[PDB]
Amino acid sequence: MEFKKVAKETAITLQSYLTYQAVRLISQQLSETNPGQAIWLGEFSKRHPIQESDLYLEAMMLENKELVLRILTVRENLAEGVLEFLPEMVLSQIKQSNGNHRRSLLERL
Amino acid sequence: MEFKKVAKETAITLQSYLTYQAVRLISQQLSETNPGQAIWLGEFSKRHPIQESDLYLEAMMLENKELVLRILTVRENLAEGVLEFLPEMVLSQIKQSNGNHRRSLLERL
C-alpha cells in the first residue's frame, strides 16, 4: 500500500474541505450578526465551487477582501484546532462504520 | 474539546474519502487478478456515488458480499498509514496557500 502518496492526495482534498468548514462557521456567525452578508456568502458559493478552494479565494478577493481575510484566519485556526484529533477520530469512525456494515451483511446472509 | 462538531464532520468526510481510495486500490488489484470483477466494480461506482459511502456499501452487499468485506478491511488499513502523514501535510499546505493568497492580496491596490 502506498500510504504517503495517498496521504498527499487526501491532504489536498482536506485543504479544500477545511476551507469549506471555515466558510460554514463564518456563515453561521453572519446569520446572527449580518444576515445579508450570510446570504451574499451563500450565493457566492453556488457561483464558485469551494472544491477549487484556491480559485474560490482568489475570485472573492475581487468582491470582498475583508471576508477572504476572515476565511484564511478561521481556516488556519480550524486546522490547528482539529488536525491533531483527526487520526484517532477518523480511524475510530471507520472502525465503527465497519462494525455497522458487518452486522448488516450478517443480517443479509 | 473545541471544534467537536467540525472535527466530527471532517472525520465522516474522510471516512468516505478513504473508502474511495480503498475501492480505487482494490480496482487496480482486480484489474490484474479478476478483470471481469474490475469492470463490475467500475460500473457499480458509476451508478453509486462513493461520496455516499454508507449507502454505496449497503447497496454492494446485496450483490457482492466478499468485495464489501474487502473494502472494509482495506479502508481501515489504508487509514492507519494515511492519517499518520495527514496533519503535517495539511498544515504545511494551508501555510503555503495562505502565503500565496497573502501575496496576491497585498500586491494589489
Residue pair A101/B53 in contact by the 8 Å Cβ criterion: no
Q: How many CB atoms lie within 10 A of CB A104?
A: 14
Q: How far does CA B22 lie from the centroid of its chain?
A: 7
Distances from the Cα of B32 to the Cα of A19, A72, B27, angstroms: 38, 45, 9
Query: Residue holding cell 471532517?
Result: B10
Q: Which residues of B fall within a CB distance of 8 Å from A93?
A: 11-12, 14-15
The Cα B44–Cα B72 span in angstroms is 16
Q: Which residues of B fall within a CB distance of 8 Å from A15?
A: 90, 93-94, 97
Residue pair A3/B78 in contact by the 8 Å Cβ criterion: yes
Yes or no, beta carbons of A11 and B85 under 8 Å apart = yes
Nearby residues of B10 by Cβ (< 8 Å), 6 or more positions away: A14, A17, A18, A21, A82, A86, A89
What's the total number of domains in chain B? Answer: 1
Q: Which amino acid is at B41?
A: L
DSSP 8-state assignment for residue B48 = S
Query: Residue holding cell 474541505?
Result: A17
- Taking alpha carbons only, the member of A64, A15, A4, A51 closest to residue B100 is A15
Residue pair B92/A80 in contact by the 8 Å Cβ criterion: no
DSSP 8-state assignment for residue B34 = -
| Partner B, chain A 10-49, Cβ-Cβ below 8 Å | 10-15, 17-18, 21, 25
| Partner B, chain A 70-99, Cβ-Cβ below 8 Å | 72, 75-76, 78-87, 89-95, 97-98
Is A57 an interface residue toward B (CB < 8 Å)? yes
Q: Which domain holds residue B64?
A: 1-109
Nearest beta carbon to residue A78 from set B1, B3, B68: B3
Is A55 an interface residue toward B (CB < 8 Å)? no
Q: Count Cβ atoms within 10 A of the Cβ of residue A75 and give its class: 0-12 exposed, 13-18 middle, 19 or more buried.
A: buried
Where does residue B34 fall: left (phi above 0), alpha (psi -120 to 50 degrees), or beta otherwise?
Answer: beta
Q: Which residues of A fall within a CB distance of 8 Å from B11?
A: 86, 89-90, 92-93
How many residues make up chain A in this entry?
A: 109
Return phi, psi of residue B62, to 5°.
-75, -25
Experimental determination technique: X-ray
- Taking alpha carbons only, the member of B13, B10, B21, B5 closest to residue B79 is B21
Resolution of the solved structure (Å): 1.9
Q: Give me the CATH number covering residue B15.
A: 1.10.1200.210
Is A63 an interface residue toward B (CB < 8 Å)? no
Yes or no, beta carbons of B72 and A6 under 8 Å apart = no
- Most A CBs within 10 A among B12, B54, B70, B94, hence the mutation to make, goes to B94
